[PDB]
C-alpha cells in the first residue's frame, strides 16, 4: 500500500493533496466497495469500505481526506505459560494457580456423502488470550505437561475502531481529524496520512493500538524459546506468563490497558510531503526522519528500505525538483494522477545496466555445463526502458529474472542511514554466475509460457471482462514497482492473469484536493464494484483503469444530479 500527503509548499495551491493507494484483495469480503454516505446534519463522506462494514475507512469529506497503509508495528505477542503439575489446563502466575477458561464447541460438518456430522473440540483461553498451537512452528513448542503458549492481540479488547472512522467521516478539519485519532487511539494495524482544507501541512501518524513493553521486559521477560524467534518474528514480545511483571504496561495517557500512550507513538506534519510504502515510520519524510520511538514500531535507521519505499520517496523528490519528466515542479492533481501510474521499476532503473555489463558479454554462456544462448535476452533488456507499461517489451523477462536473483551478498555498497534511497547498491561481480543462472531460468520460463521475450507487457499482464483481455500495467513491489499489479499466477500458466485471486494490488485509488470550489476527487476501483459477472458494474471501472482514465466522482448534490448516468430510487421498510 502507498499513500502520499502533500502540503501547500509542494502543491503551490491553497490546499494540500492526498493520494490513497491501498494494495488489497481483488476478491473476497475484505475487498473495498466505493460509495458515498449523505446523512442529513451528520455527515457527507465518500470513499471505500470493506464489504460488510457500514462506515467509510478510506475516503474524504468536504474538509479532510485520508488513506491507510499496513504498519510494521507489531499488534500481538506470545506468552509462555508454566503449567500446574497434574493439570495441563491450569497455569501459574507468581506461584498462584489459574484455571484456563474452557469452551466445548460443536461444529456441524457436511461429509462428502451429503450427510452432516458433528465435530467437537474443547478450546481454552488464558487471561492473556487464546491458547495457541506453535507445534508446527517448532515441535519443541508443543503443549505439554510443563509449558503451553497463548497469543495476545491488543485489538481483542479494542472496540473504538468503527467509532474512530465514523468521527473522521464527520470531521470538519484536519485538526479535528488529528484530535479524534488521539482521543480514540483505535486504529488497529495501519498507518494514517491525511490532508485538510485550509491547512498548509500534511499529516502522518502510526497512532493506534500497539502492545506496550519496556526495554527491561524485552531483556528479562523473553524466555529461552522466545529468543529463538527473535529472527522470524522480530519485535514480537515473547514473554514469560508466570510473572506479572512481564504483563504489558499501561501509560498515563493510554486509552487501552497494555497499549502505548499517545505521546510515545510517532506522528509528523510537513508543508512539503509525508509518505509510507509499508516500511517503518522512519521515513515519513526523507528530509525529516523520525527516531526514538518504541522498537515495536519497527527499525528507524538500522534496516534497509524496500525497493518500493525507495521508489516511492524518489518519485516525490524528483517531482519537487522537476526532474521526473513531468511539467513543472509541483504535486498537482493532474501530475500526481500520472506519476502514480508511471510504472517505474526501481530494480531495473538502478541495477539493470550493472547486470547486463557483468553477464551479457560474452552472450554465449556455459550454465550448469550447458550451452545457453542469451543474446536475445540481453538485446531485449538493453532496449527496454525500465518501465512496466502496456507497450513495454521485455518487462516480464526482468520480472522472471529479478525474482530469482539471490540477495545474499548481492550488493557491495551497504545500507547507510545517510542514504536510505540509494543504498544498498552496487551489483557484486562475484554474483556473476548466480545471475546467469537466474537469467537462464528466466528465459526458459518465458519460453514455457508461449510469450516472446519482447512481448508487450499488456499481453502478459491482463484482466478478462466480457470475454476480452483488457491490457494492464504495473507489477510487483518486490521489483521496485510503485504501480502494483501483482498476479499470483505463474507466467507458464497463461501469463500474469488478474482474473483469479491476485496478490495485494491496486484497488481503490483516490487523488483528493480541496480547491476554492470544494473537494475534488478522482478515483479508480480496479476490479469494479460488482462480483456478479452479469452485472453492468463488473467491468466498467476496470475498462477505464486499463485505459488509465480516472473518474471524477460526483460529490455535491448538483454534481450527483447532473451526472450523465444519474438514476435515483428510494428504498423503505418498517424498522
Amino acid at each position: 500500500s502507498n499513500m502520499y500527503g502533500f502540503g501547500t509548499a509542494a502543491t503551490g495551491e491553497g490546499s494540500g493533496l492526498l493520494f490513497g493507494n491501498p494494495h488489497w484483495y481483488w476478491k473476497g469480503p475484505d475487498r473495498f466497495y466505493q460509495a458515498q454516505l449523505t446523512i442529513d446534519g451528520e455527515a457527507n463522506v465518500s470513499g471505500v469500505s470493506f464489504l460488510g462494514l457500514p462506515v467509510i475507512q478510506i475516503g474524504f469529506n468536504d474538509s479532510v481526506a485520508w488513506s491507510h497503509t499496513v504498519s510494521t508495528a507489531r499488534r500481538f505477542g506470545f506468552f509462555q505459560l508454566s503449567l500446574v503439575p497434574g493439570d495441563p489446563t491450569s497455569y501459574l502466575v507468581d506461584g498462584v494457580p489459574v484455571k484456563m477458561k474452557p469452551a466445548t464447541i460443536t461444529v456441524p460438518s457436511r461429509n462428502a456423502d451429503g450427510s452432516v456430522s458433528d465435530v467437537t473440540r474443547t478450546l481454552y483461553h488464558s487471561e492473556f488470550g487464546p491458547l495457541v498451537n506453535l507445534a508446527g512452528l517448532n515441535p519443541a513448542l508443543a503443549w505439554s505437561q510443563q509449558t503451553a503458549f497463548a497469543i495476545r492481540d491488543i485489538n481483542g479488547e479494542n472496540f473504538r475502531t468503527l467509532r474512530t472512522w465514523m468521527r473522521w467521516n464527520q470531521a470538519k478539519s484536519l485538526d479535528e481529524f488529528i484530535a479524534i485519532q488521539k482521543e480514540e487511539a483505535g486504529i488497529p494495524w495501519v498507518n494514517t496520512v491525511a490532508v485538510g482544507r485550509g491547512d498548509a501541512k500534511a499529516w502522518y501518524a502510526d497512532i493506534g493500538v500497539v502492545p506496550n513493553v519496556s526495554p527491561a521486559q524485552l531483556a528479562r521477560c523473553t524466555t529461552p524459546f522466545g529468543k529463538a524467534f527473535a529472527q522470524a518474528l522480530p519485535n514480537v514480545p515473547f514473554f514469560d506468563g508466570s510473572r506479572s511483571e512481564c504483563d504489558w504496561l499501561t501509560d498515563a495517557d493510554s486509552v487501552q490497558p497494555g497499549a502505548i500512550g499517545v505521546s510515545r507513538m510517532p506522528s509528523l506534519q510537513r508543508d512539503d510531503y509525508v509518505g509510507n510504502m509499508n516500511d517503518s515510520y522512519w521515513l515519513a519524510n526523507v528530509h525529516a526522519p523520525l527516531t526514538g520511538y518504541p522498537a515495536i514500531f519497527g527499525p528507524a535507521g538500522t534496516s534497509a528500505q524496500t525497493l518500493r519505499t525507495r521508489m516511492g520517496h524518489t518519485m516525490v523528490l524528483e517531482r519537487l525538483a522537476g526532474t521526473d519528466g513531468y511539467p513543472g515542479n509541483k504535486a498537482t492533481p493532474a501530475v500526481v494522477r500520472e506519476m502514480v501510474l508511471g510504472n517505474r521499476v526501481f530494480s531495473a532503473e538502478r541495477f539493470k545496466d550493472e547486470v547486463l555489463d557483468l553477464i551479457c558479454t560474452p552472450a554465449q554462456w556455459t550454465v550448469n555445463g550447458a550451452a545457453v544462448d542469451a543474446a536475445q535476452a540481453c538485446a531485449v533488456l538493453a532496449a527496454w526502458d525500465n518501465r512496466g507499461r502496456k507497450d513495454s517489451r521485455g518487462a516480464h523477462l526482468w520480472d522472471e529474472f529479478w525474482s530469482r536473483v539471490p540477495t545474499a551478498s548481492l550488493f557491495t555498497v551497504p545500507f547507510s542511514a545517510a542514504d536510505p534511497l540509494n543504498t544498498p547498491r552496487g551489483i557484486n561481480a562475484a554474483a556473476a554466475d548466480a545471475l546467469r543462472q537466474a537469467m537462464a531460468t528466466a528465459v526458459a520460463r518465458v519460453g514455457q509460457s508461449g510469450y516472446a521475450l519482447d512481448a508487450p507487457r499488456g499481453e502478459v499482464l491482463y484482466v478478462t471482462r466480457g470475454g476480452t483481455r483488457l491490457p494492464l500495467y504495473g507489477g510487483c513491489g518486490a521489483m521496485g514497482y510503485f504501480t502494483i499489479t501483482c498476479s499470483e499466477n505463474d507466467i507458464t500458466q497463461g501469463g500474469y492473469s488478474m482474473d483469479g485471486q491476485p496478490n495485494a494490488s491496486n484497488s481503490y485509488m483516490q487523488v483528493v484536493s480541496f480547491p476554492a470550489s470544494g473537494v475534488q476527487a478522482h478515483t479508480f476501483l480496479t476490479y469494479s464494484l460488482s462480483d456478479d459477472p452479469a452485472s453492468p458494474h463488473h467491468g466498467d471501472y476496470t475498462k477505464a483503469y486499463s485505459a488509465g482514465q480516472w473518474l471524477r466522482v460526483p460529490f455535491t448534490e448538483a454534481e450527483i444530479t447532473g451526472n450523465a448516468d444519474y438514476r435515483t430510487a428510494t428504498v423503505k421498510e418498517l424498522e
Binding site: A35, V107, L162, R163, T568
Partner: protein, 169 residues
C-alpha cells in the same frame, strides 16, 4: 419507525446514499453492497458465524482469500466461534454509541431486504441466489465481521493454530 434511504447511482454505478438518520444510512448501504456483491458477502457471513463446514464441507478451504488466509473450513469455524464469541460481541456492542448500533441494525435490515429480492427472482447473482447459505443475517452477525476486521494484525494469522490448541492426552 421505518428505514428510508434514497439511492443515487452515477457512472461506474457508484452509489450515493442519502438518508435522514444513521439507521437509514446503514439500510441503504447494506442494500447496495448486497445488490452488487451478494455471493461474496453471503459466503463471508458463513465464515464469521463459523457455519462454513455445514454447507461447504469441513475439509474444503475458504473460497476467498482474505486477511484470514485460506485455512480449512473446520479450523476456521472453530477459530471464529472461539475468538469471536458471543461475549466478545457483547463487549464490542456495549462500547458503541447509539448511532452506530442503529446504523448496523439498518445495515442488516438493508442486506436482508436484498436477500428477499434475490430469492424472489431476477437474473442477478445466479451463482448463489438459490443456495441455502444465502439467508438473512442479524446485527450481531455484522458486528462479528467488524470485530473480525480488527484481528488482521494478530489472531487472524494464527487461525489454524488457535483452532488446534489442545492439551496433552
Amino acid at each position: 419507525s421505518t428505514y428510508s434511504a434514497e439511492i443515487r447511482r452515477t457512472t461506474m454505478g457508484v452509489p450515493h446514499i442519502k438518508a435522514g438518520n444513521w439507521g437509514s444510512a446503514g439500510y441503504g448501504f447494506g442494500y447496495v453492497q448486497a445488490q452488487d456483491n451478494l455471493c461474496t458477502m453471503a459466503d463471508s457471513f458463513l465464515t464469521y458465524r463459523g457455519e462454513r463446514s455445514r454447507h461447504l464441507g469441513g475439509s474444503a478451504q475458504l473460497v476467498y482469500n482474505s486477511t484470514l488466509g485460506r485455512p480449512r473450513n473446520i479450523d476456521s469455524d472453530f477459530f471464529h466461534r472461539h475468538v469471536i464469541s458471543d461475549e466478545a460481541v457483547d463487549r464490542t456492542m456495549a462500547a458503541q454509541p447509539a448511532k452506530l448500533l442503529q446504523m448496523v441494525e439498518g445495515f442488516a435490515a438493508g442486506y436482508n431486504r436484498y436477500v428477499r429480492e434475490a430469492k424472489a427472482g431476477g437474473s442477478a447473482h445466479a451463482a448463489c441466489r438459490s443456495e441455502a447459505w444465502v439467508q438473512p443475517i442479524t446485527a450481531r452477525d455484522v458486528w462479528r465481521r467488524i470485530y473480525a476486521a480488527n484481528l488482521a494484525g494478530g489472531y487472524s494469522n494464527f487461525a489454524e493454530a488457535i483452532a488446534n490448541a489442545q492439551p496433552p492426552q
